[PDB]
């Protein structure tokens with residue numbers, strides 16, 4: 001709804017905004033990637049960078065203008081350019097960054113800058129609380145390998161919102177996207193584990209489509225069933 | 228639906244088949260693209276190549292194997308890889324190729340091989356029939372700039388079928404897809420002009436969706452209005 005530089009920002013809930021940045025892909029044009037911004041009391045929480053450091057500095061600029069609270073931390077949901085391409089801008093701003101330990105391990109070979117802190121997960125997928133200090137309403141869940149081996153998801157406590165990142169596609173999508181890094185054998189179970197971990201969430205936020213209903217989860221799982 | 232190598236074919240009408248080829252793209256994965264094959268008495272007409280020369284050779288071998296009538300000509304609907312990627316294959320088979328004069332002018336910078344013959348159009352968008360000799364039931368119409376500046380469309384006289392190529396998306400599509408070369412100002416008008424040129428066609432065939440009703444045209448136009 002709201003333009004700011006080349007970025008776009010839309011409010012989803014009282015204290016929740018989706019940030020959107022675009023990268024030109026050869027032979028297609030502008031590809032959208034979405035993350036989240038969350039106001040928790042007198043601090044801001046960011047889920048995912050933009051594609052670039054410049055775009056990510058613009059997210060911080062927008063936060064300063066529209067919210068005017070410091071950014072306490074950022075969580076990034078896997079080690080790909082659309083989620084972690086802007087890590088340097090976060091670190092330059094003095095923001096504490098968090099990622100799945102596996103994302104941090106993969107980040108060098110994926111061409112990304114690793115986050116400063118590492119999240120680890122229990123066998124049921126939930127983040128170990130000790131690795132995720134003062135995450136406010138952010139509930140962080142590792143659903144298993146799918147889009148990548150490291151992809152994680154975030155629900156926002158007190159809202160109807162759960163963020164699937166690039167794991168989940170919208171209910172009208174045609175493909176699961178590029179399968180180069182994908183765990184085709186476990187994708188279906190991982191999508192359904194995300195759905196089961198946030199069983200009441202009704203607004204499913206994702207990386208490359210506008211928010212959808214839980215049919216996005218069912219349809220994504222249904223596509224993966226065929227792989 | 229029948230398979231030959233990497234190609235898939237679906238019979239839409241007694242003398243009309245849809246051909247589908249796939250190109251694996253970074254991020255998007257395997258993207259499907261549809262063209263048409265039309266049996267016109269004792270010869271075959273082809274609308275659009277596959278993504279590559281080898282896939283287009285596969286189309287020609289399936290034609291021989293399954294239909295066993297000579298391919299008299301092909302018409303390609305704009306200068307993009309999924310529509311003109313197999314031009315070299317058609318020329319190697321000695322098939323006469325036709326494209327919008329503008330498509331052949333843009334083809335070199337788009338990385339494509341021009342067709343051997345150029346179609347020109349009247350002020351009302353209809354092809355100048357002297358430049359499309361012996362096209363049989365193919366009625367070629369240039370709707371105006373939209374998906375690209377050069378996109379053209381094809382009706383099959385005597386059927387319920389009209390082919391919008393990449394200009395038209397299906398009635399439930401969430402976006403207009405590949406807009407990197409699009410004419411955002413004129414897109415809605417051109418999509419509607421396509422519908423007015425084939426006023427009775429009930430089966431709308433397109434490049435990146437399964438065949439749909441005329442709702443695909445009106446929905447595509449509404450989405451374009453928003454640009």
Ligand SMILES: *C(=O)ONC(=O)OCc1ccccc1
Pocket residue numbers: 027028174252255258396397400401402403404405435436
């Ligand atoms: C449109 O309804 O769906 N568009 C679409 O599938 O295009 C995807 C695409 C990606 C990259 C290059 C060409 C097409």
Ligand SMILES: O=C(NO)OCc1ccccc1
Pocket residue numbers: 025031082169176177178208253254255256
């Ligand atoms: O398939 C998707 N989104 O639905 O990948 C999006 C994308 C496109 C290009 C480059 C990275 C990521």
Ligand SMILES: [Ca+2]
Pocket residue numbers: 053085087088113
């Ligand atoms: Ca950097």
Ligand SMILES: [Ca+2]
Pocket residue numbers: 280312314315340
């Ligand atoms: Ca070639």
Ligand SMILES: [Zn+2]
Pocket residue numbers: 078079080147148166
């Ligand atoms: Zn990714």
Ligand SMILES: [Zn+2]
Pocket residue numbers: 110180181
């Ligand atoms: Zn990779």
Ligand SMILES: [Zn+2]
Pocket residue numbers: 033080082166207208
């Ligand atoms: Zn992504």
Ligand SMILES: [Zn+2]
Pocket residue numbers: 305306307374375393405
């Ligand atoms: Zn195109």
Ligand SMILES: [Zn+2]
Pocket residue numbers: 027337407408
């Ligand atoms: Zn181009």
Ligand SMILES: [Zn+2]
Pocket residue numbers: 260307309393405434435
């Ligand atoms: Zn196309």
